[PDB]
């Protein structure tokens, strides 16, 4: 059912409808010679769409907009990037050129600028302290603490019980950390426990890369992170 990394040529984007007015978007990218899938989110709000994260690069993000127009046909008016890496902000310039108001926390914008990644235009206030939550149209934005990155946000869709964990949450198929160059390994399990504590009702949990599942993805991620720590 859910699109897998093997089925998506690099440059194409698939959409997966989760609930009324909630989709994930799935793209693939080459990185260090391997191909990785990557997820983002689309949430309807009236006759407009909120986009969560780019599709990992300008070409993919243009394909994303075209797939949204083809399959949904409503305009993306705002976008949120959930941390500063290129699978989250790469494509922000494509969004901006299309008339999308792009958003990220000041921390994400700061880090993207330091790293040389695309910088979302608008700032999300009220998210700088672990445990902070703010409403953003049809979603809630939550800063759980440092994890995969110091700036990573999670997104919750209360109407659909969809928890988008982004890259702080691993799919079950991933049993090793991979790359954690920007991570806070010491804090990551605590940050996951904040997500659990804040969204225990979540039914559909979406990792930054790979297959969705339930809240068991949180304990799974902690297991992997602790094993890597050791
Ligand atoms: Cl704008
Ligand atoms: Cl605006
Ligand atoms: O990432
Ligand atoms: Zn990342
Ligand atoms: Zn604006
Ligand atoms: Zn990622």
Strand order of the largest sheet: 1-2-3-4-5-6-7
Assembly context of the chains = monomer
Spatial extent as radius of gyration = 16 Å
Summarize the amount of helix as a percent range: 25-40%
Query: Distance between the terminal alpha carbons, to the nearest Å?
Result: 35 Å
Class by SSE composition: alpha/beta
Q: Bound compounds, please?
A: chloride ion, hydroxide ion, zinc ion
By DSSP, the count of extended strands is 12
Count the domains.
Answer: 1
The string of secondary-structure elements, in order, is EEEEHEHHEHEEEEEHEH
* Tally of helical runs: 6
Largest sheet: 7 strands, mixed
Strand-residue proportion: 25-35%
Pfam family, one: Lactamase_B
Main location: periplasm
Binding site for Zn(2+) 3: 87, 167
Domain Metallo-beta-lactamase: 37-209
Brief write-up:
The chain is of the alpha/beta class and 230 residues long.
Describe this structure in words.
The PDB classes it as antibiotic. Keywords: Metallo-beta-lactamase inhibitor, NH-triazole, inhibition properties, crystal structure., antibiotic. The assembly is monomeric. VIM-2_1di-Triazole inhibitors with promising inhibitor effects against antibiotic resistance metallo-beta-lactamases. The protein is Beta-lactamase class B VIM-2. There is one protein chain. The longest helix is centred in the N-terminal third of the chain and has 14 residues, at 58-71. Strands 1-2-3-4-5-6-7 form a 7-stranded mixed β-sheet. The chain has a 5-stranded mixed β-sheet with strand order 8-9-10-11-12, with no helix packed on it. The protein has helices at 58-71, 86-89, 92-97, 106-115, 188-198, 216-229, and strands spanning 13-19, 22-31, 34-45, 48-52, 76-80, 101-104, 122-123, 132-136, 139-143, 154-157, 162-166, 204-207. The chain contains 6 helices and 12 strands. It has one domain. With 230 residues, it is α/β, with parallel strands linked by helices. It is globular and about 45 Å long. β1 (13-19) and β2 (22-31) form a beta hairpin.
């Amino acid at each position: 059912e859910y699109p897998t990394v093997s089925e998506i040529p690099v440059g194409e984007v698939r959409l997966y409808q989760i609930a009324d007015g909630v989709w994930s978007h799935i793209a693939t990218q080459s990185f260090d010679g391997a191909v990785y899938p990557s997820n983002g989110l689309i949430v309807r709000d009236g006759d407009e769409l909120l986009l969560i994260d780019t599709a990992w690069g300008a070409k993919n993000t243009a394909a994303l907009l075209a797939e949204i127009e083809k399959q949904i046909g409503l305009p993306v008016t705002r976008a949120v990037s959930t941390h500063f890496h290129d699978d989250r902000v790469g494509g922000v310039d494509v969004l901006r050129a299309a008339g999308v108001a792009t958003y990220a926390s000041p921390s994400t914008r700061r880090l993207a600028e330091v790293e040389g990644n695309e910088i979302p235009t608008h700032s999300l206030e009220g998210l700088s302290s672990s445990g902070d939550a703010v409403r953003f149209g049809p979603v809630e934005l939550f800063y759980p603490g440092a994890a995969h990155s110091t700036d990573n946000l999670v997104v919750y869709v209360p109407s659909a019980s969809v928890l988008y964990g982004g890259c702080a949450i691993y799919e079950l198929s991933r049993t090793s950390a991979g790359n954690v160059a920007d991570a806070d390994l010491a804090e990551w399990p605590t940050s996951i426990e904040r997500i659990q504590q804040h969204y225990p009702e979540a039914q559909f949990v979406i990792p930054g890369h790979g297959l969705p599942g339930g809240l068991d993805l949180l304990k799974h991620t902690t297991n992997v992170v602790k094993a890597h720590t050791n």
